[PDB]
Symmetry: C5
Subunit: 309 residues, 5 copies
């Protein structure tokens, strides 16, 4: 009894990740085929109906089922519409769309995270007793120049037809509450180049050269240099957070920065201590200089336990 | 006599809080059911009317009352509309919406604020003598990975149908001035993660380490260094202001920063004081040295009386 | 002859002031009542016609005159429309609007300026021989938590019906160049809180401690520290300009910064001077030290004639 | 043979110059008058048609020619449309518009540039054999409290009606390839106030005090300080470009900053030279000190011959 | 059998490249000519149908094939539409458009990159058995004062009609899967001035002057300065990244900055090494001074082999 509808989704561009909103843009076309009461067409050739005309055929009683992108955020930008009406009953709906879609996204592993871009498609009014998805095909471009792309799309789309029970329906009871839903998935990993070389590396180099505070010979030189190193971290904190995507949690890079702030406060506690440890007023040289290769290990080992995954 | 309307609101996403404008975005569906004069439907089965076709039934006189979101800011983006016409009189309105909504929002406890996301729903044209809200259902998705969300939704939505006296009317007098209104409330708190770890903590380390100025032994070392400390607070003031939400009042971090400005201006006053307090130019190294844990308590006390609540 | 129309304007939110464009947003409702040729209504009860149906009645020849917001910038976002048609002739137009409005805005005393939010309403086609405004009512909410509002609405709203002569007309001549215009005024003052505590004050502490450059005892110390003070000002300029509203002129704050810029250059010239004022190559430490209160007073005096308002 | 069209343009606001896009915003009204087939109006008084109704009259065969703003960027926001239909034949089209317009804009003398704001209006479909522009009237308010205005309008609008021959037309040949085009010009200059006091002047004070490095005593003092002077220029470059208009070229202010970078690199090149020029290792203070007026004049001499215009 | 369509594309402005999205905007006209069943026109002169009227003529069965821009991103803003209906059958569609287009864009050689802006035009429904592009003419303005333009368009546009096989179709079989496609390409190179003079050059000047650490005479001086130089580079990274285009990879300038980061970390390592390389702990001033001409040549040699393309 229920009508079988065949869907094909051609994906043109996935662009513009919104990190705070957990959304993304997808441009492509959607195709839908189903079969109805056969029809008299001008010539025994299939009939083509574009854009403003489809509305007219609907007023004469053509059944064109509303298919909703569930995880889209607000009505998508619809390009051209097409009905290809075959004389032998079958009907093809073809539409181009650009829409900003929503999905759960964990950005904690930035810049080395993998994400999956999803489309969720479901009919708006007719349940699986009325309209069901027979099959789903998703086609993607084959990207070869992905090294100039922000994201490396990682493997072909996965498809998934299932049924959804909306328990709370104000309608009827026997199975009038289940709807048939297509789900498209595309896996991807982030192109970590720019973030590796232009952010991670110099943060290391800076945190590195911070240790070279201990090879200054007076105390006065060492503590005062600590305040210029101090400022540099704040500056580097400002630099990253202004360019990196805003998020509600700490990333890898964010943590290196918290680590950089610690190492600098750490030295200030010691440099000030070594000036006062033992009697004689001795700048505990017994302590410093031994720190010239103590801290680069202390930071680098107690820093080797950031396995938050 | 009055028409009874039953409302169901499905909430999909509450995102994009706007601090300055006091708004937030809500994507969902809204459902309204009422019963009218029973009807001839094709088959004794309910009738489904999608989108552009609803306008047609209106011109032939189907009564579909406009229900307005009172606390929206501008006409919402409405996705698919749907009428389900049952033969036994009952009528179901189903429409998807995305809208920017307004409510009172206090951000003084940032990053530890609790908010109320609110919806207020009321008919646009018909009073409670004519149309009244019978009951209200609000459904919320269940967030399990809340550690990657901007906001933690805290408990299920509370609702309240109420009545409103509109004083200034051009209509008539006998009981023609009250309207039926749904009010949905959702409580939520901010995910304080990114801000404790990447803002509060280094502000402490910076504000703490400002104090290590008193462990320099020269006067020249002490006064000149605090000016490097001065630059560091403005840079940190600059960092915060660029990333934290724009507001028309001071937050806690805002106050700590001013305290940071004070702690350093205060210090410059003592350093200059202890050098000329006593006769002969003897540097009062009793005031200094006493300051080495005088300030870590004074600030830590005058900031421990930021109990403004 | 001319139709008297009674207007009521309900204001919900005045938000989103744009300083550079001198615009602001207003959300509210508008009511217009006038009386025409009496009508057949279903029941002796008034007829309610919403949204898409109003357009229909215009085509059957119903007169609904277009009332234009003079100072709106672009087509306002119209929410729900409603006609209330009375059997006794009279007609009530009700529509919700959100719109961006323009008015002259002087921001020179920022953050201590007062602005007035203005609405200017005038019919689009019909002069006052045809359509004139009988009376105008403006209703505004009671801001109770005004300490959490950015703008303090200061006294209830002002109203004023008037007539406007359009000299340059391509029409006729006979007093057909005058139009009936409602002009709503709302005065408001800026909540100067955030800017005092987080901008004016720390700028003071910074400008003040600039003066403590004269209590360094060396010439090298005094001269070299001022270059750091210099850096501290440029830094503070960047903090302010990036956060404060952008304008085509200098504000109060904009000037303080220029003063700090001056004072440091003033200090640099003295600090470099007292090193060469007297013969012997002796530092006129009479001059400096006089400066420990020449600048804190001199700057504070020739800068205390900042009665520029 | 051709229909004469008389145009009136009332300009309400010119705002929002986009420096990078070379565009500017214009709010106003446009009025076009022509004379046609005399007509029956209800009563012997002219007829008014508003908004949605103009379309209806177009369908019963009223000619209202589409007039295109040639240098607009994308379809403009048309507020109200109004048709005034005269019994003696004349037809007056009155429409309010807000649109983003384009013109070549050279911003190289910023902040001392003059721009001319242009409107170009031409019929979309009809040539000068068919439709021609009779006259163009442009009405502008006179902005007198121009001191809070970003731009000083250098007098009332100039116009130029001409004919434009389009080579590549797919139409017919004998004189059917020329179109009637109005060109409105408004001249204006930028108010250099804000940019003089808040950008030009403190850059001068800083570039000036940069020179006060030659008045430090040891070579260590002299060289170590210019690296802080260096940091200061970079801090100031950042301040400007983040607030000043975005462009594809160097401005005046841009160059001042390049000059400051030069002066400081120049001083370092000299400071290091005067230290090793002679044998004995003796400090060549003949070269230094002479530089105390070499740079303050050299920059001020080689910098007042920037007659690049 | 198939209809020949002759296309003309007039390009008005190419503006607003989005580096991240790999998009750019194009304003222009499109003209399409084909010949159909001849027609009786009012007078024996061609008929002009504008905008809303074209819509009407379609509903009575005028064939106007919808032509889609393949690589536009979202529904472009259609300006005026015009049908010119000739009596001898031919039909000309002319419409103005503004749209955002996508193409692969490689920005690695910034600011010296070349881009080609492409337009790809193809019918939405009709194959080359039904509709084909006969010829394509492309018209571009001649940029004469191109020195104020961000992009230099380099030569006339190249065009190419070709045919496209779509494999995955549910439609017909005998040659029914191929579509006709116009492809326009426009070459352009970037105006490298502003980025050369305001970014590359002062970056050189700073990276150079960084080297002058080796001419300070104390170890204390040389090392403490490296930390101030360190700060200057972080500042300069922030300035560039905030002003320059966002990309997913490192550019030439991004590389210069990493080099400055390296050179400074390089020196810190040597300065600290030269202090302990030799026995006695005496500063190996042999290594130093040799470094005064090691780095400007070493950096200039191993950095002139960044021919990475
Ligand atoms: F306040 C400062 F941080 O400003 C900039 Cl980044 C510095 F350090 F270069 F001066
Ligand atoms: F960074 C260096 F310039 O050192 C500190 Cl921040 C200054 F500016 F005070 F000199």
């Amino acid at each position: 009894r229920p009508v079988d509808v065949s869907v094909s989704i051609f994906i043109n561009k996935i662009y513009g990740v919104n990190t705070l909103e957990q959304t993304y843009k997808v441009d492509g076309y959607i195709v839908a085929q189903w079969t109805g009461k056969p029809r008299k067409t001008p010539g025994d050739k299939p009939l083509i109906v574009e854009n403003t005309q489809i509305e007219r055929w609907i007023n004469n009683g053509l059944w064109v089922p509303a298919l909703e992108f569930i995880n889209v955020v607000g009505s998508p930008d619809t390009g051209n519409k097409r009905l290809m009406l075959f004389p032998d009953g079958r009907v093809i709906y073809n539409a181009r769309f650009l829409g900003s879609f929503s999905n759960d996204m964990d950005f904690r592993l930035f810049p080395f995270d993998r994400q999956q871009f999803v489309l969720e498609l479901e009919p708006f009014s007719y349940n699986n007793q009325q309209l069901r998805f027979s099959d789903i095909q998703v086609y993607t471009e084959n990207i070869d120049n992905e090294e100039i792309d922000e994201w490396w799309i990682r493997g072909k789309a996965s498809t998934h037809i299932s049924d959804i029970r909306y328990d709370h329906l104000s309608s009827v009871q026997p199975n009038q509450n289940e709807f048939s839903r297509i789900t498209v998935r595309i896996d991807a990993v982030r192109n970590p180049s720019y973030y590796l070389w232009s952010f991670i590396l110099p943060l290391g180099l800076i945190i590195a050269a911070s240790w070279s505070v201990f090879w200054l010979e007076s105390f006065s030189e060492r503590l005062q240099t600590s305040f210029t190193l101090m400022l540099t971290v704040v500056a580097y904190a400002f630099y990253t957070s202004n360019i990196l995507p805003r998020l509600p949690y700490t990333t890898v890079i964010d943590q290196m920065i918290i680590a950089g702030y610690g190492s600098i406060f750490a030295a200030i506690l010691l440099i000030i201590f070594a000036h006062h440890r033992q009697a004689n007023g001795v700048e505990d040289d017994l302590l410093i200089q031994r720190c010239r290769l103590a801290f680069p290990l202390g930071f680098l080992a107690i820093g080797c336990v950031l396995v938050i995954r």
